[PDB]
Design a protein around this ligand. Structure first.
Ligand SMILES: O=C1C[C@@H](C(=O)N2CCN(Cc3ccccc3)[C@H](c3ccccc3)C2)c2ccccc21
Ligand SMILES: O=C1C[C@@H](C(=O)N2CCN(Cc3ccccc3)[C@H](c3ccccc3)C2)c2ccccc21
Lengths: 301, 305
């Protein structure tokens, strides 16, 4: 019993983190096989960051200008190449600790573990969700760039996120491992603002299922509702529309608890209209939306 | 910026987790050097567990009856031993992945990372606190016994917790690595009273400093208070009394934010008397006591291991 925000064990990713230094810029790189992946803004200087032309900088650089260090050992850089907002440094030695891995692009709502890193060393691990507005509410300081987010299935590490920047808002923007930004952000020191965020409805519901499993049942009510009636209420309270895909995804949890999805949706509606009343669910006085249906099942299995 | 419940990187510990099997019972063990540590209830049967005579049960066992599987290879057991509520299996081979490590007994109020494991394989990691009443509020299922809690300082892993049981209440109890229970608990399948819990006051204050550091300042007040006055409020709301030691531990955070401890205490008092008021502090509608002053600095300093 119990429910906690739980990250994947970070051992496999730890063995891939390196430090990448170019001129005076240092950040974190991800060393898989014979390739080192990192944010392209490592090739920049301060002055360039307000209006950088990355095409020119990469040609003005050579293999030897890139210092790659795995722990205390220097990797030798064979070649360098740019893909979107990520630089790929070919190195002379394959990473002996390289796990089975995939690169994946996650959708808003999906969760992952972040291993926050400085100078190629790990500081800590926490769990995050990709918000609908395509930001993440992380914990990152100067030098955290190149830190990565991931999921682990058995032995396979699916990398989904590399950290690039903090917005003036204090939220966090970054790319997939192909170097494409999540959301509309760019790697410049410009205005760029994140859109108004929304609550991930399917996740909240999963959380309510998790509460029921753990003996929190007070919010359960005798009402039922319809997907349409419920979406009307979701819209009012800035909640993502619930789809039939969502309802299907909640089937296993519905089955386990014997509470039909639309009945749980009626509980939720009531919680949105009446609030918490000063009660708590699973130790929280707010509705939590950073656990997927998969996370709730995983955690109960 | 931002502030999250951050666990330590769990690599060093992952390589120490093994499966221990004895008869039909399987659980997790911790393999350091040439010794494997697990809960002694590994020797028990579901019958025995209401009133186990551990000495007698252990006698019926020989070290050949203890199967330790690291990943997929079996280790050979030379000698077995019971220490308090832990069993120490002497094994053939020193663990090649043994980190620099210590065994420590943490205090109520201190935090640690838990690596939840099943069948000697790690499932996830989360940060929690040793409650004043010596319980933890974890996430643990059948098979999670022998999962460990730890802190890391640079290269050194300080093991402080091994998981033994879920109480009927649904909270978790366990031992240090010498097998001594935190709290009044025993490894028997009996209902057992956890005492009344308290909020860890020093930690809430540390969290308030963390909030100010991240731009959440709304709770900051024009008032101030006294240690005694504040402590009368603390006792009303089942908060731990604040001592001068706690004030001193908060000194660095006080200096960074330029906000005196007793001023922050006045803030806290007001939050206790008037509530949150539908607002949030660092994304929570409750006062969080699961961050020490050392954890706040760690996260805001960005220390690595
Ligand atoms: O989460 C973090 C990441 C980090 C951070 O935001 N940095 C780091 C530096 N870079 C600039 C740079 C590149 C080369 C040389 C000199 C400066 C990033 C950047 C990337 C793209 C557009 C604008 C800025 C911005 C940061 C700083 C303070 C607080 C929290 C966070
Ligand atoms: O967090 C968990 C840990 C786990 C759990 O509680 N177990 C596991 C078995 N053991 C007994 C056993 C030993 C050998 C053979 C048969 C039974 C523990 C125990 C230890 C000491 C006193 C009483 C019970 C109790 C558990 C089960 C369901 C839900 C959540 C949790």
């Amino acid at each position: 019993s119990g429910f906690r925000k739980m990250a994947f064990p970070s051992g496999k990713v730890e063995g891939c983190m390196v430090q990448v230094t170019c001129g005076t810029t240092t950040l974190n790189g991800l060393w898989l096989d014979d390739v080192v992946y990192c944010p392209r803004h490592v090739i920049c200087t301060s002055e360039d960051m307000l209006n950088p032309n990355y095409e020119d900088l990469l040609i003005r650089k050579s293999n030897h200008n890139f210092l790659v260090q795995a722990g205390n050992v220097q990797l030798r850089v064979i070649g360098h190449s740019m893909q979107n907002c990520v630089l790929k440094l070919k190195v002379d030695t394959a990473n002996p600790k390289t796990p089975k891995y995939k690169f994946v692009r996650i959708q808003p709502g999906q969760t992952f573990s972040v291993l926050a890193c400085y100078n190629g060393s790990p500081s800590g691990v926490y769990q995050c969700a990709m918000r609908p507005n395509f930001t993440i509410k992380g914990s990152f300081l100067n030098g955290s760039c190149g830190s990565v987010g991931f999921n682990i299935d058995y032995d396979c590490v699916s990398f989904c996120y590399m950290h690039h920047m903090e917005l003036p808002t204090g939220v966090h923007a970054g790319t997939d491992l192909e170097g494409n930004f999540y959301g509309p952000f760019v790697d410049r020191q410009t205005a760029q603002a994140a859109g108004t965020d929304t609550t991930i409805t399917v996740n909240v519901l999963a959380w309510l299922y998790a509460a029921v499993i753990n003996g929190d049942r007070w919010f359960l009510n005798r009402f039922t509702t319809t997907l349409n009636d419920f979406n009307l209420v979701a819209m009012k309270y800035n909640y993502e529309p619930l789809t039939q895909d969502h309802v299907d995804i909640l089937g296993p949890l519905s089955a386990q608890t014997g509470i039909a999805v639309l009945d749980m949706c009626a509980s939720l509606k009531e919680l949105l209209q009446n609030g918490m009343n000063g009660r708590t669910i699973l130790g929280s006085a707010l509705l939590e939306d950073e656990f997927t249906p998969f996370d709730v099942v995983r955690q109960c299995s």
